[PDB]
């Protein structure tokens, strides 16, 4: 029928926000064209050869030529949530990159086919909670998310410690 | 103590999905605190003008692309005080070319604050989808810092919608 694939792209960061709050990882979510946060990717169309073939296709389109300097494999797979109402099964993948690899995506993402149409920009995910106990991750989640993207995210943070 | 933030925007001829007109590209950013806000920060002692600490904080946050244009008093829009923090927040709107803006977006990843104070830049969606909730109505649901949303919502009426 209609399968959709989206990727979390994550690179470990030794950097320290304010020089004391440790970042731990760079994680890329995108601001979509509906004003909801989510992940790179989307529909697997009819003449795609595999789930994963179709994903790397959408990463290129949404992220740019730099997304092509790696490939999400079957092995990067995490989950599949069935969207019942809009009859669509939605597959998730998490790809470990170098911070050099992940920065090359962000720097190239403004030349992406879909930059400034489907993809309004890329945002890193703040993992820290700030002293006030609310600024950071807790607030980041208060934002608006398309379909299961908040679950996907929280499962990814969970799965790998956090 | 005073703060300054800029709205940067460009005539965008583009059509989303080849029909929906984008009108203007408008830069906001995803902040270190997980809120949407505008590039800028606290002005201090040596900054001769409000515009000096502003343009200075745009250099830090948007990279050496904002060293092409300069915001001045002519761009001023509002001063909203935040009672609790005691601070007076000042707002501007700077008109650029789509090419000037693309060049900020593209450059902002080599800025001092990329992956620290600044988590990413987003274009605001000025349109509304057929469900009448997709786009701006949905966008404004997001978290924003202090008077960030009011500033946006006031500039849009004053030119952009
Ligand atoms: C001319 C034209 C007009 C269009 N008008 C509209 C419109 O008005 N409204 C509209 O919604 N779409 C519209 N689209 C289609 C749009 O480009 C999307 O492909 C479509 O809305 C469904 O995909 P998506 O935006 O949800 O994200 P896609 O990346 O295309 O993903 C497809 C599916 O995955 C889901 N999804 C998206 N991001 C995530 C994520 N991070 N995690 C999990 N699941 C995710 C979506 O809910 C959808 O079910 C239009 C397309 C064209 C060509
Ligand atoms: N976009 C914004 N609009 C208005 N006030 C803001 C905005 N971003 C931050 N602030 C506030 O202005 C001060 C300076 O913020 P900052 O730029 O993060 O140093 C803080 O007291 C914030 O509460
Ligand atoms: Mn798509
Ligand atoms: Mn997509
Ligand atoms: Mn789940
Ligand atoms: Mn600032």
Residue numbers in the entry:
A (entry chain A): 19 to 180
B (entry chain C): 20 to 180
Quote the study on this structure.
The Nucleoside diphosphate linked to another moiety, X (Nudix) superfamily of proteins constitute pyrophosphohydrolases of substrates that include (d)NTPs, nucleotide sugars, capped (m7Gppp and Gppp) RNAs and dinucleotide coenzymes including NAD, FAD, dephosphoCoA (dpCoA) and their derivatives. Among the Nudix proteins, Nudt16 is the most promiscuous. To understand the molecular mechanism for the recognition of FAD-capped RNA by Nudt16, we determined the crystal structure of human Nudt16 in complex with FAD at 2.7 Å resolution and the structure of free human Nudt16 at 2.3 Å resolution.
FAD is bound in the active site of Nudt16. In this binding mode, the 3′ hydroxyl group of the ribose is exposed to the solvent, and the first few nucleotides of the RNA body could have interactions with the loop containing residues 101–106. The adenine base of FAD is π-stacked with the side chain of His24 on one face and positioned against Ile164 on the other. The α phosphate is coordinated to a Mn2+ ion in the active site and has hydrogen-bonding interactions with His24. The β phosphate is involved in ionic interactions with the side chain of Arg50. The side chain of Arg38, also from the other monomer, has hydrogen-bonding interaction with the N5 atom of the flavin ring. The AMP portion of FAD is bound at a location generally similar to that of equivalent moiety in other compounds, such as the m7GpppA cap, inosine monophosphate (IMP) and ADP-ribose, suggesting that the deFADding activity shares the same catalytic mechanism as these other reactions.
